[PDB]
Nucleic acid binder design. Structure first.
Ligand SMILES: [Mg+2]
Ligand SMILES: [Mg+2]
Ligand SMILES: [Mg+2]
Ligand SMILES: [Mg+2]
Lengths: 49, 306, 290, 122, 190, 44, 94, 87, 139, 51
RNA sequence: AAAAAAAAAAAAAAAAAAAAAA
RNA sequence: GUGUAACCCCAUUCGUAGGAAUUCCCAGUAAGUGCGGGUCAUAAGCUUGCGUUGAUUAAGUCCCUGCCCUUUACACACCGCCCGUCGC
RNA sequence: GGCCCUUGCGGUGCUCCUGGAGCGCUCCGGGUUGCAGGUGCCCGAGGCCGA
């Protein structure tokens, strides 16, 4: 895992603006639906074959 | 000269009293010959086809014993009857050597599982002892009185034990003393090869105060056992037509493409008679026969002491 | 030695895999040999490759070992050497169990019984292999009566599990005396199925080759998958009339397991046969008889 | 083969030959003489020490296996061998291993968390 | 360096006044240990327990008697307390006291029996030194155990007084009585 | 600087001075590039 | 139904003597018969050119084969035979 | 006495110094059992090599000049200022 | 430059101890505790055996830490002794001359061989051998 | 059962070049994460970017 | 197929990344 | 031992067991102690594994109680005939 | 320990005698060199594999 990072070495995280998260949330939600859609179509092809 | 054996003889021994000579061979047979009538009157073989590596006979001469290359077990026969008395088991790996105690009639055998085992023959309860070692054992010898035992190990140490008490009396470090030289075809240097070679022949003096050790070198080292110091070093030979004699190979023979040993190898093997064969270390079929390595196969000291 | 034992086992299992192929390879050879010896059409399955079988047939001779059988490899030294049997018990034995283990020593010629203290199961198998022990017996008990028996052939031989039913010991019977202790004759009766031939082999090889004139008799009789152990000695008072006097323990056996490995390898060894009691036809089936 | 099958000479000669080939490992099982025509020049190459080191998983590449014997990291019993042309018997293949005080055996023992300076260096 | 038992009892000053028992009492410089707990195999071979130091043998034989077997540390502390009490009371080296007690307690001749159902007869016979040491240690341990039983006195004091009396040669000790009666019966059966 | 497990320089089996039948193998691994277009012949 | 003794290829000198005494039935007479049989069988081997030719091929091959194994093979058990010693002083063997 | 491999001091002979005057010669027996040294005052001393304990002392008629030991025979040669040689 | 350190193993039954020896001032610790704090103290002298054999002058130049796991009390004590002695011998071989290593080793061997070489106890009994002596059994 | 059988023929002397750089931890072969190996100049640069 | 590790996202999901079985 | 520690150790207080017969046991063995599992049989106040602490005596004779065999490979050396009965 | 235009630090380019394996050179001498029988050698790929 190697989770630990020392206090001196660690860097502050990125702080996203509200507009960026709205765009970023749109893609992941879109990708989840699209990935789900393809996987369902995979089983229909295999059953018919 | 006796030619009854078909393959090579690995070990040989005289009986303590009679003029009888006992040999063990790769034939799988241990044969006894008499010097009064010049005949092979007794032959011992194992029930199982196995090859023997050494022979040991009791001081009384009633018991004959041998060890194997592969079956990992010591066979003991009776001299007068000629039947297989017993098979002693317990070792793991081949048996490097055997020796009877001259005065007590017990058998000491060293093996490659870092152990030396003591077997009691005339004992009703079959008492056995084990002596554990740091590295693999190669040879075992008793002092003439029989109260002290010597084991050579693969890390080139000679350890002196007390057999009756199973306690280590002393040790001798001998790696540095065995000056060993590089062969013509060796890629590695002398030191790297020496780090992997140990003593393989041991012999006590007649009085027992000194020990003689030898191996794959032109030197035999005589040590003082009690002080654990090297009293003397004997040079066996100075012939430089024998392989591995000198530690540093001559720089004069080097060229850009190497020392080019195979040209001289073909010139030497031009003797004919047989055809050199790949993978044979020793013999006529061995390619490296014209210039063999220098090796002291065995040492022995006169019972007279002169 | 440890590498030798591991190396030999892989050869043993590997040969077992191809024993079916070699039997099939051999069986098709005689049909062609029968086809050539008596002039007749070669069977169409042998119509191809027929010349190849003839060449190997011409190579066939008495010198070759022949087709391999896993039973022969397991019991290699059955006839040539006398077996060496070691008998031990479970941890913390009862008084009556130590009597039973004392009696099995006398039944088997040359057997030795060693005290089981804190010895782990793995170490005993290692020590027995090192000293050339051929066979190992382990016996269990319940409330002072022996109830389980395990027979193991040390050189990666089969391990057979048994359960005892009706045990009567000599220590119960007063003033019997001393046993004959000679090399015994063996009587095997009732074993007809293929598995029955397997089980009778394991029990027979626990004993050495006897003498012709020996008067000691040991009987293994099978009746509805229960093996009866009986021990007798006979005296011929006159021709055709014989008297039987019973000596030694009397007990019954029921086999339920044969494993290819030794009793150190419960976790890896395969099962040659097991008793399955929850099958619908379990009550109405027998396996040691046909 | 051409000799009669029921001849004592053939039987003794057949058993002697297959017993020597099986020991060297050139023949898989001590079966019939049919196995004896399967031996080739390659059958000898498979019994050399460098390819045996490949079989025992001590080495993975044949150039690496040949490299080790020349650098003296492998011993057959107490003897250390440097000749790649060295046919090893079925018995002797059980006793090929790293020579003591070799850097490879140090790496193996370090990996297994079993490295003690006392025994190795001594 | 000098090796002293329990850190305070030296072994150089110890001397044995019996030539017969010199080879079977291990107390001298080679057999000197810091504690009577070495975890060796002294029962492996015949005659090997002659190499085990006498204090460790006393510790082992004190474990068998009147105790659940396998508790060696308790016996070690019992021996330590007994040595401390002996030094306090007598003022000399307890090792010398133990050696003298073992020398004195050992019978010199015993009686071998030939026995039938009706009557038993005896012949006086010699005793080997190893059996002398074994019987001496056994008698001292048994005497200490019997003195300690059903009394307000811990085993350490009884052991200490037993060794004191045996080393003095007094007849108040169990081992001296047993030895005297054994030699008396052997004398009567000559 | 020293080399071990050396072998003499010999002809390789993949040399094009050999004929195509004699040549061992082209020893070429093909990877479908993600940017590469997929083209197929599918009769209507 | 007992364990049946299997047939050994190895013959010790204790059952070799038994066989000769068994069929014939003084000791010199027993040895005389067997020695003649041994020589008669040996002459048969030399009179077949094919067996002679095959035996020489085995010799050349086997000496090659054991050398490759550095003399590590399964040995042949020694067969008991009868040999002729003659009554003359032991100097001749030296 | 110094170790050759590491160069670490391994002790000294005598409580403070071996001899009153200068040390002319030192010698070690072949078996590493006896160490013999000389002084300008005319004394010849023999020491144990291991535990560094004095054994014996010999007075010389004249001051020793040079000193060598023949190890295997155990023969010691002394040259003195009075031109004589003592063995 | 680089630190001189040696780690060695000691074993006794199921008890295993790992000892690390480096250049130091004489500190010996077992599981973070001094030697005198190890229980049971009845065998404390068994735990102090090497030092008393060799003196403080040899241990004054090294720092040793031992981590021991498994087994009981006595097995752990024996493992700790073996690990300490082996670690000291290895260090004086590696970073001191060989003469001192030889002298320390033969002193330790002369006292008790268990301090350096562990001897496992295996199964050896009369029962494995047949009845009677090796000779004279069935002629 | 498949895994336990494989342990039977395991050869302790086996050697692989991955073994040199990787050490077992309690018997488990953990692949430790690679180091980043920053140098002081870049380490000073990240802090200036952070502020 | 599966046990992991590294990122983001939503009130868990998603992309890459290794080993093991087959 | 992956199916959704006691024992021991230090210190404190208190304070005077099983006949006659019979069975078993030789080294990590006898004896004490704890901790798991229930594994296609057997097992419930039982059965089996695992570890910890770890001894006394003995290494040899046929005297009693018995068991297994025998009394027809010519080195040197040693040794130099088992007996009785009834049938054919 | 010693060092004073220094370094617990590092690198280069030439020289350093072949055992058989640079033989043959004091003088003298070197000119007239004054068809027995031979038939060789080479030609095998199957894995108790590893990745
Ligand atoms: Mg118990
Ligand atoms: Mg127990
Ligand atoms: Mg009671
Ligand atoms: Mg319990």
């Amino acid at each position: 895992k190697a989770g630990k990072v020392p206090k001196d070495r660690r860097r502050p995280a990125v702080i996203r603006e509200p507009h960026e998260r709205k765009i970023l949330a749109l893609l992941d939600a879109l990708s989840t639906v699209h990935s789900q859609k393809m996987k369902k179509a995979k089983e229909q092809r295999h059953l018919h074959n | 000269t006796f030619t009854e054996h078909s393959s090579g003889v690995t070990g040989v021994t005289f009986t303590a009293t009679g003029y009888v000579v006992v040999t063990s061979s790769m034939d799988g047979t241990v044969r006894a010959f008499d010097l009064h009538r010049y005949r092979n009157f007794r032959t011992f073989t194992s029930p199982r086809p196995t090859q023997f590596s050494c022979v040991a006979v009791d001081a009384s001469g009633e018991i004959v014993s041998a060890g194997a290359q592969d079956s990992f077990e010591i066979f003991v026969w009776s001299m007068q009857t000629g039947r297989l008395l017993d098979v002693l088991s317990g070792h793991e790996g081949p048996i490097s050597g055997l020796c009877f105690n001259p005065m007590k009639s017990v058998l000491a055998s060293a093996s490659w599982d870092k152990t030396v085992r003591l077997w009691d023959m005339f004992d009703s309860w079959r008492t056995k002892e084990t002596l554990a070692l740091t590295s693999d054992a190669l040879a075992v010898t008793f002092r003439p009185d029989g109260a002290e035992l010597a084991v050579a190990t693969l890390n080139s140490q000679i350890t002196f034990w007390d057999p009756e008490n199973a306690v280590q009396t002393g040790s001798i470090e001998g790696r540095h003393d065995l000056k060993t030289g590089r062969k013509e075809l060796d890629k590695i240097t002398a030191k790297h090869a020496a780090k992997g070679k140990a003593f393989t022949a041991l012999c006590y003096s007649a009085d027992g105060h000194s020990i003689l050790a030898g191996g794959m070198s032109k030197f035999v080292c005589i040590y003082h056992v009690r002080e654990q110091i090297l009293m003397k070093r004997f040079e066996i030979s100075c012939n430089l037509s024998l392989d591995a004699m000198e530690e540093f190979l001559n720089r004069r023979k080097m060229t850009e493409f190497g020392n080019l040993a195979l040209i001289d190898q073909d010139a030497g093997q031009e003797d004919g008679v047989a055809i050199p064969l790949p993978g044979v270390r020793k013999g006529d079929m061995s390619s490296r026969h014209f210039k063999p390595e220098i090796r002291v196969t065995s040492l022995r000291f006169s019972p007279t002491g002169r | 030695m440890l590498r030798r034992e591991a190396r030999l086992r892989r050869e043993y299992l590997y040969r077992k895999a191809r024993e079916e192929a070699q039997r099939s390879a051999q069986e098709r050879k005689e049909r062609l040999r029968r086809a050539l010896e008596e002039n007749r059409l070669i069977p169409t399955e042998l119509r191809r490759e027929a010349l190849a079988l003839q060449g190997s047939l011409e190579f066939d001779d008495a010198g070759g070992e022949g087709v391999t059988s896993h039973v022969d490899d397991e019991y290699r030294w059955a006839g040539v050497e006398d077996p060496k049997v070691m008998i031990t018990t479970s941890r913390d034995p009862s008084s009556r169990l130590k009597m039973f283990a004392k009696e099995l020593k006398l039944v088997f010629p040359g057997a030795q019984r060693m005290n089981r203290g804190r010895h782990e199961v793995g170490a005993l198998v290692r020590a027995c292999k090192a000293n050339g022990v051929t066979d190992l017996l382990v016996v269990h008990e319940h409330r002072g009566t022996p109830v389980g028996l395990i027979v193991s052939h040390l050189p990666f031989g089969p391990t057979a599990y048994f359960t005892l039913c009706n045990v009567v010991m000599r220590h119960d019977i007063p003033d019997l005396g001393t046993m004959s202790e000679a090399k015994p004759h063996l009587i095997t009766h009732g074993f007809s199925s293929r598995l029955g031939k397997r089980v009778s082999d394991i029990l027979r090889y626990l004993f050495p080759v006897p003498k012709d004139d020996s008067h000691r008799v040991i009987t293994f009789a099978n009746q509805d998958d229960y093996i009866s152990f009986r021990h007798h000695v006979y005296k011929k008072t006159d021709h055709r009339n014989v008297e039987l006097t019973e000596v030694g323990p009397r007990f019954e056996l029921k086999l339920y397991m044969i494993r290819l490995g030794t009793l150190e390898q419960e976790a890896t060894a395969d099962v040659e046969w097991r008793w399955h009691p929850y099958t619908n036809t379990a009550r109405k089936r027998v396996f040691l008889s046909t | 083969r051409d000799l009669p099958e029921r001849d004592q000479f053939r039987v003794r000669a057949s058993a002697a030959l297959l017993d020597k080939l099986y020991a060297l490992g050139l023949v898989p099982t001590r079966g019939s003489l049919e196995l004896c025509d399967f031996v080739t020049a390659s059958s000898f190459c498979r019994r050399r020490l460098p390819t045996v080191l490949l079989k025992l998983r001590m080495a993975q590449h044949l150039q690496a296996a040949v490299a080790f014997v020349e650098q003296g990291h492998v011993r057959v019993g107490p003897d250390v061998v440097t000749d790649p042309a060295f046919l090893v018997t079925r018995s002797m293949e059980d006793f090929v291993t790293w020579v003591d005080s070799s850097k490879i055996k140090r790496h193996v023992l370090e990996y297994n968390e079993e490295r003690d300076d006392f025994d190795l260096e001594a | 360096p000098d090796i002293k038992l329990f850190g305070k009892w030296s072994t150089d000053d110890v001397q044995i006044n019996d030539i017969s028992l010199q080879d079977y009492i291990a107390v001298k410089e080679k057999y000197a240990k810091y504690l009577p707990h070495s975890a060796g195999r002294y029962a492996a071979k015949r005659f090997r327990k002659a190499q085990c130091p006498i204090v460790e043998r006393l510790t082992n034989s004190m474990m068998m008697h009147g105790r659940n077997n396998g508790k060696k540390l308790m016996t070690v502390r019992i021996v330590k307390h007994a040595f401390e009490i002996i030094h306090l009371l007598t003022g000399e080296n307890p090792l010398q006291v133990l050696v003298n007690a073992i020398i004195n307690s050992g019978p010199r001749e015993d009686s071998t029996r030939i026995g039938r159902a009706g009557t038993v007869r005896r012949q006086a016979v010699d005793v080997s030194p190893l059996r002398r040491v074994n019987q001496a240690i056994w008698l001292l341990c048994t005497g200490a155990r019997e003195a300690a039983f059903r009394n307000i006195k811990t085993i350490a004091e009884c052991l200490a007084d037993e060794l004191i009396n045996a080393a003095k040669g007094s007849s108040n000790s169990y081992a001296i009585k047993k030895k005297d009666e054994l030699e008396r019966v052997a004398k009567s059966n000559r | 600087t020293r080399k071990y497990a050396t072998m003499k320089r010999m002809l390789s089996l993949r040399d094009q001075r050999l004929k195509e039948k004699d040549r061992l193998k082209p020893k070429k691994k093909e990877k479908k590039d993600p940017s590469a277009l997929k083209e197929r012949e599918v009769p209507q | 139904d007992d364990v049946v003794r299997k047939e050994k290829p190895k013959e010790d000198a204790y059952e070799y003597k038994k066989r000769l005494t068994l069929d014939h039935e003084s000791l010199a007479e027993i040895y005389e018969q067997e020695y003649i049989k041994l020589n008669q069988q040996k002459t048969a081997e030399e009179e077949n050119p094919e067996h002679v030719e095959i035996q020489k091929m085995m010799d050349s091959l086997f000496l090659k084969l054991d050398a490759l194994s550095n003399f590590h093979f399964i040995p042949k058990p020694p067969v008991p035979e009868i040999k002729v010693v003659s009554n003359l002083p032991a100097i001749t063997m030296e | 006495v110094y170790n050759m491999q590491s160069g670490i001091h391994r002790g000294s002979f005598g409580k403070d110094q071996a001899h009153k005057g200068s040390v002319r010669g030192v010698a070690v027996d072949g078996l590493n059992q006896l160490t013999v040294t000389t002084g300008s005052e005319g004394l010849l001393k023999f020491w144990n090599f291991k535990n560094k304990i004095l054994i014996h002392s010999v007075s010389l008629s004249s001051s020793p000049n040079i000193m060598l030991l023949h190890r295997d025979s155990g023969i010691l040669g002394l040259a003195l200022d009075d031109f004589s040689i003592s063995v | 430059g680089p630190l001189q350190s040696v780690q060695v193993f000691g074993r006794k039954k199921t008890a295993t101890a790992v000892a690390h020896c480096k250049r130091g001032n004489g500190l010996i610790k077992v599981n973070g505790r001094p030697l005198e704090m190890i229980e049971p103290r009845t065998l404390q002298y068994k735990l102090l055996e090497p030092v008393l054999l060799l003196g403080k002058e040899r241990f004054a130049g090294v720092d040793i830490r031992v981590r021991v796991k498994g087994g009981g009390h006595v097995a752990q004590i024996y493992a700790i002794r073996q690990s300490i002695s082996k670690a000291l011998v290895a260090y004086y071989q590696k970073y001191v001359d060989e003469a001192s290593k030889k002298e320390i080793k033969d002193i330790l061997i002369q006292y008790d061989r268990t301090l350096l070489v562990a001897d496992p106890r295996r199964c050896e009994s009369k029962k494995f051998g047949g009845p009677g002596a090796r000779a004279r059994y069935q002629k | 059962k498949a895994l336990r059988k494989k342990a039977l023929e395991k050869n302790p002397d086996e050697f692989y070049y991955k073994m040199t750089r990787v050490k077992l931890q309690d018997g488990v072969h953990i692949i430790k994460e690679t180091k980043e190996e920053v140098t002081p100049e870049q380490l000073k640069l990240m802090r200036t970017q952070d502020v």
